[PDB]
Design a protein around this ligand. Structure first.
Ligand SMILES: CCCCCCCC(=O)OC[C@H](COP(=O)(O)O[C@@H]1[C@H](O)[C@H](O)[C@@H](OP(=O)(O)O)[C@H](OP(=O)(O)O)[C@H]1O)OC(=O)CCCCCCC
Ligand SMILES: CCCCCCCC(=O)OC[C@H](COP(=O)(O)O[C@@H]1[C@H](O)[C@H](O)[C@@H](OP(=O)(O)O)[C@H](OP(=O)(O)O)[C@H]1O)OC(=O)CCCCCCC
Lengths: 606, 606
């Protein structure tokens, strides 16, 4: 983090500056660095603050000839790495490779500079603190700085390609993680050119990711297209139109528990959505969704709608009886109460409601059995945090099933107050039907807009709206504390004044007006101020920024709908039985092609 | 001002045109101006309307050879400036320098033309009347016209760099104040090149502003970057990423009472906000806000929210007793009144309200002690006029504390009518919580939008809305003056007709409708006209221009939020004790660097 790196950098510059050997290595004096090196008592193993030698200083400031004098004074400076924590394995070869001083790389490799050196300090890790991630080996350093000849020269002296770091990343992984993609595709070609073969391309990191899977996850569409140039075979071309066969082994991921498409659609990187726009992935999901995914999602949508209708019908016809106790209160409004369990089921219609309630609790147990192990199979925050996988819809469906089982416990144990979980369950259950809106293009991104207004716009403006409601509700309550509550009951106590001011903010109830009595004038002053600031200004401000939130989602409508039908497709292929979801693509074994599955794409060009 | 300048210009052209010597100097006649100059009785000291000589006329119309004949006729014309008020010190050298006639500059400097001449007329001051501001000395004139060789020639003949004018501005100040910056940066380089040294760069004007501070205040981002090229030192570069150390002495402004960042953020010039986008300022405020400013602002926000909760709770539980006098009026609605001070505190809950009220008045005194001297330390209009410093929020918090102290005066002196300052104090206090919305990016510019709709849109449309309310309220009142007020009480008297028409404009109450009686038909005609013009047309017009006001603020959202967290950071560093705010940046004294503080920035490039 920042102050530790700053302390390390000024200490390193101080130990360069005070030491005359390191200063002469820094500023490249040929008047100096010959009198000092002719002393046999002079310490050529003098280290800086981070344990770096004078050769590290000469490689850092691009002093080639000073590094040659430091090398001929003592040849062991190439073997020595730095020692302190942010640079705990860095050699002078790493600095010469990053600086791309190629004659210095030849001068170091003429000496005994190790090519298998691991620069495993904290300044070389993949972190948000570090501005780059190049790896720990000099070969990955030379691949990431983009110099071809240093890569070939490291190949000429050792430096095997298959080197895995602390993250398990091969040089192909780190080259995929670089921001410049077209500048690194040529390096990916030349690094694959020295492959002698478990292949180099198929070895994973510590996250289990293949370079194909890492190119899919990180949004590297250029590298994905480059990797699918070598996985495709043009069957024929004829005039404008050509038929080509894409290998579907790395994309479909049949035997894998965590598939490639599931890895891409549930990735934190946003640009992985443009991975879904690339061709064999696009026709693969189009075949999976049109052939199987849309009818299965439609019959699940209709079955859930019928289950909601059964739940709603057993909610309307719930057992209620006239209350035995008397009212004796003009404010009291309840004329009937809940029925006891011993008298709830005495008739035929109550038995019809019983089989409806049994269907309801069976469906809630089915929901819990379907959605509880998929919380545990992935990250618990990752399951609910995803806007594409239906995470908010997942937590709504989970708490709906929990409220239905709580209602069953309340019914079996004769607990009064069954209105509460039944009302929450009705609202959350019928709002759960919007999960199936993602199966259609016409109302798919509408729920994405609704989600981006719930947690996008409402969570920020709710604080300003809340403090306006608190101030005007407090003023409205204390200006009516001295008045008769029969003539104007909107602000009689503090919770009903809070609720009335919330409804007057949203303009869903009328302004309180009794023209048969004369109200306080401070009601008129504070309500004119409230109607100016809250109903007129802040409400339409919230409406306008909801509008441009809707505009921002509507610009990316097709990509977001494509991503959520991908998440729906991989969810349905993962959850449903294997006989209902046959393996996608051309089988290939009967055509002489060996145990590989393919997708044929015919496209029209010039 | 305009007519005086016009009268001066036509008088000057008249005195040129009537005088044959000045006419021959104007239109460059070599047939003339040899017969006239051979007369020994001819007055070569003949002056125009502004006291300008014939050499001023020859320098004004770029007549070089006419100026040579005027100089060899009488060499003292270079020593004479003009005399009347808009040009009370202007010489012919100033006109020759502005015209960039360099041979005329050599011809004047061959004679005894003073280079320390001050053209201190009203046409050379920094005013909105004058279209340019070049200064009073010819060296600043040559710097601001951008001619390099005239600057070098003036250096060859006197003309010291460190010349301060009536505004105290050095040539560096005036060169910063020029609108075209990149062509003036090389002139700044040349003017710093003849510095022999209190330095030239550190001398202030009469406002106390350094050229660094003036470049920050005026929004000169190009000159700010040029001034920070000489205040930075690259520690190292390595491949794509470099670490460089910025001097933080001129930016942090430790011992100064009016700091650099406070000068930039409270400046009237708008482009100074882009000064906040430049690099060491940006990481300095990012370090100050993330390390210290955001937690201190968050604990102050939570403490103010708890103080509002205590004030609101002692507002709800205020002492009220049943009224002794009888009602005897069907319109009368008050059933209880304020309690006397002798009986207000008799119970334990009244003592809890007493310690809450003591906390409330202590907080109001604390607010007044914190915000009254900062009105006086700056401009009184400047404190409240700033949208970034929280000036409207400052006057709301000031009047909230004033209303709380007025409420304490009413409580101690048993004054009836305590609803009024308590209701205003509740509204203004809970609206003061939006001051702390600027500490978060997600709801920071929302209050800027609210302010730009209060004083931007509402103050212009309130007049049109007001005259519509007056006309329709007057018509609604006089069409119901003849009717029974029991059947329709919305327009019974003129203030309630005004309030009803305001609420019907905002559509927060229903249209008045009694279907048990037959209303006047002019109520239906005027309400149809009102519903067309006011509820439908002008209200949605106000909503639409509120929407594009919101759009205009949302385009500059990050810059406005950055400016207001800068104002928050400099407010918190100025107000809070020094032990809670340590000095920002690297100390530097332990690294051998002499008594200067630095900020290290590491950045990634090609
Ligand atoms: C009762 C239901 C509970 C639901 C539980 C689940 C609630 C939940 O998980 O929502 C998280 C929500 C959005 O989730 P998510 O991480 O997927 O959204 C990302 C990010 O939040 C951006 O704001 C999005 O907009 P933009 O492109 O940058 O403009 C962008 O969407 P997209 O570009 O990829 O489409 C995404 O990068 O994040 C919040 O906004 C903070 C509010 C916290 C949520 C409030 C938690 C109470
Ligand atoms: C009760 C609370 C009292 C509050 C007391 C304090 C009230 C108060 O001081 O507001 C002043 C207000 C805005 O102040 P301020 O000078 O900072 O705003 C500038 C200017 O007014 C422009 O209109 C702004 O918009 P734009 O960019 O050109 O489009 C621009 O904002 P920004 O670009 O910098 O962001 C600024 O250059 O000026 C008025 O609009 C006239 C209404 C007079 C105010 C009405 C006075 C009653």
């Amino acid at each position: 983090w920042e102050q530790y790196r700053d302390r390390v950098n000024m200490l390193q510059q101080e130990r360069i500056r005070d030491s005359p050997l390191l200063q002469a290595a820094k500023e490249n004096d040929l008047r100096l660095l010959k009198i000092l090196l002719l002393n046999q008592s002079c310490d050529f193993q003098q280290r800086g603050a981070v344990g770096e030698t004078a050769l590290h200083v000469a490689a850092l400031y691009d002093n080639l000839e000073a590094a040659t004098l430091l090398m001929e004074a003592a040849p062991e400076l190439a073997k020595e790495p730095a020692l302190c924590e942010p640079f705990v394995g860095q050699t002078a070869l790493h600095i010469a490779v990053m600086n791309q001083n190629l004659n210095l790389v030849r001068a170091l490799l003429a000496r005994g500079a190790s090519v298998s050196a691991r620069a495993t300090g904290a300044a070389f890790r993949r972190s948000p603190h570090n501005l780059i991630y190049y790896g720990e080996h000099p070969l990955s350093f030379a691949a990431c700085v983009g110099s071809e000849e240093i890569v070939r020269l490291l190949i000429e002296h050792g430096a095997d390609i298959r080197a895995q770091d602390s993250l398990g990343n091969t040089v192909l992984h780190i080259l995929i993680l670089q921001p410049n993609k077209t500048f690194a595709c040529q390096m990916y070609n030349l690094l694959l050119s020295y492959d002698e073969h478990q292949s180099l391309e198929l070895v994973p990191n510590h996250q289990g990711l293949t370079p194909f899977k890492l190119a899919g996850v990180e949004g590297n569409t250029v590298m994905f297209q480059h990797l699918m140039q070598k996985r495709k075979h043009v069957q024929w071309t004829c005039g404008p139109l050509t038929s080509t066969l894409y290998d579907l082994t790395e994309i479909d991921s049949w035997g894998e528990e965590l598939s490639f498409l599931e890895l891409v659609v549930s990735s934190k990187k946003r640009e992985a959505r443009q991975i879904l726009e690339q061709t064999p992935v696009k026709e693969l999901v189009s075949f999976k969704w049109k052939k199987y995914g849309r009818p299965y999602f439609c019959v699940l949508a209709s079955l859930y709608i019928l289950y909601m209708i059964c739940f709603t019908t057993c909610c309307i016809y719930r057992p209620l009886k006239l209350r035995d106790d008397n009212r004796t209160d003009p404010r009291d409004i309840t004329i009937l109460q809940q029925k006891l369990l011993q008298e709830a089921y005495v008739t035929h219609q109550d038995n019809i409601r019983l089989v409806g309630e049994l269907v309801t609790v069976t469906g809630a147990v089915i929901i819990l059995l379907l959605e509880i192990p998929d919380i545990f199979r992935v990250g618990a925050s990752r399951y609910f945090g995803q806007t594409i996988l239906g995470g908010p819809f997942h937590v709504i469906i989970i708490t709906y099933a929990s409220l239905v089982l709580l209602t069953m416990v309340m019914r079996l144990t004769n607990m009064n107050g069954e209105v509460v979980p039944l009302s929450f369950a009705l609202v959350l259950g019928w709002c759960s039907v919007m999960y199936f809106a993602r199966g259609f293009q016409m109302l798919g991104p509408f729920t994405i807009m609704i989600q981006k207004m719930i947690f996008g716009d409402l969570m920020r403006f709710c604080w300003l709206m809340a403090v306006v409601i608190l101030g005007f509700a407090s003023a409205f309550h204390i200006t009516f504390q001295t008045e008769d509550p029969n003539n104007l009951g909107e602000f009689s106590d503090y919770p009903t004044a809070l609720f009335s001011t919330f409804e007057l903010f949203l303009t869903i109830i009328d302004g309180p007006a009794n023209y048969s009595v004369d109200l306080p004038f401070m009601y008129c002053i504070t309500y004119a101020a409230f109607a100016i600031i809250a109903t007129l200004l802040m409400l339409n401000l919230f409406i306008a920024m909801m509008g441009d939130t809707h505009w921002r989602v509507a610009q990316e409508r097709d990509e977001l709908w494509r991503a959520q039908v991908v998440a729906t497709t991989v969810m349905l292929e993962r959850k449903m039985p294997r006989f209902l979801w046959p393996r996608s693509g051309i089988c290939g074994y009967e055509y002489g092609l060996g145990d590989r599955w393919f997708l044929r794409v015919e496209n029209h060009h010039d």
